[PDB]
Amino acid sequence: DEFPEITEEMEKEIKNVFRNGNQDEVLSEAFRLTITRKDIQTLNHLNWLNDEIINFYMNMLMERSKEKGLPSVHAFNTFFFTKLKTAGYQAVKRWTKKVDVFSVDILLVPIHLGVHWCLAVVDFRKKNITYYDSMGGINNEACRILLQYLKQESIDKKRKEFDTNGWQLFSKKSQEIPQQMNGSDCGMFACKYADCITKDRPINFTQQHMPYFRKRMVWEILHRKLL
């Protein structure tokens, strides 16, 4: 019931970046990504997270997954899924070059649906593929698309077949997990869902939390450090 407080000193650091100045100021740079204040702005107010923010955030979850006790994580980039549902395996099999997807516990798959964002999570321990939409929607297909992707992928690289024995594909209910109230906070919900999920915590927060999360997210990215 208790969330890392943002001190007045942290508070100030956020102000200094949400401020007018060159939309090139290079605020942060990591995982081949570069957050400028242009990008950082999409977290301001009720704006709409751009891809840079989201890609950066999932990477910090990936980074965080190294420290032991946590399940390991691969985060697919945000153009992986939309360039699958549209063009199929041969487009993407190349992106996984020098990467073993089975060596980790969890894969995160940010899904860009038009102007909306949701998420899919593969969990090898639970042998399940789950879909999260803070608009309570569904995508029984997206999950099939991913299991199909796994089969195909074990084929290429491991030359083996992937054992789908006991795997379960579902969309999270829309109940229990909390839902958005603001169309722009969809990027946040996908981020925060992924955060809880990668720490194996229950999803605890609500919509009332999102202005706290955004400012926090700004701080975290500036410091490349997750509270």
Strands 116-123 and 73-75: unpaired
108 has which bridge partners? 75, 121
Which technique?
X-ray
Strand arrangement of the beta sheet that strand 168-171 belongs to: 73-75, 106-113, 116-123, 128-132, 168-171
- What lies within 8 Å, CB to CB, of 11 at 6+ separation is 215
DSSP letters for 205-219: --GGGHHHHHHHHHH
- CATH code of the region 1-227: 3.40.395.10
Residues with Cβ within 8 Å of 98's Cβ and at least 6 positions away in sequence, in order, are none
Catalytic amino acids? 116, 133, 186
- Torsions phi, psi of 112, nearest 5? -95, 95
Q: 168: which 2 tokens?
A: 């379960």
Classify 189 as helix, strand or coil.
helix
Residues 3 and 12 sit within 8 Å (Cβ to Cβ)? no
Q: What is the resolution of this structure in A?
A: 2.4
Residue 162 contacts residue 173 (beta carbons within 8 Å) = no
Contact present, 218 and 17 (Cβ < 8 Å): yes
Q: CA-CA distance, 28 to 26, in Å (whole number)?
A: 6
CB 109 within 8 A of CB 80: yes
Give CA separation, 43 vs 37, 73, 131, 185, 213, in Å: 10, 24, 24, 9, 10
Question: Strands 128-132 and 168-171, how do they pair?
Answer: parallel
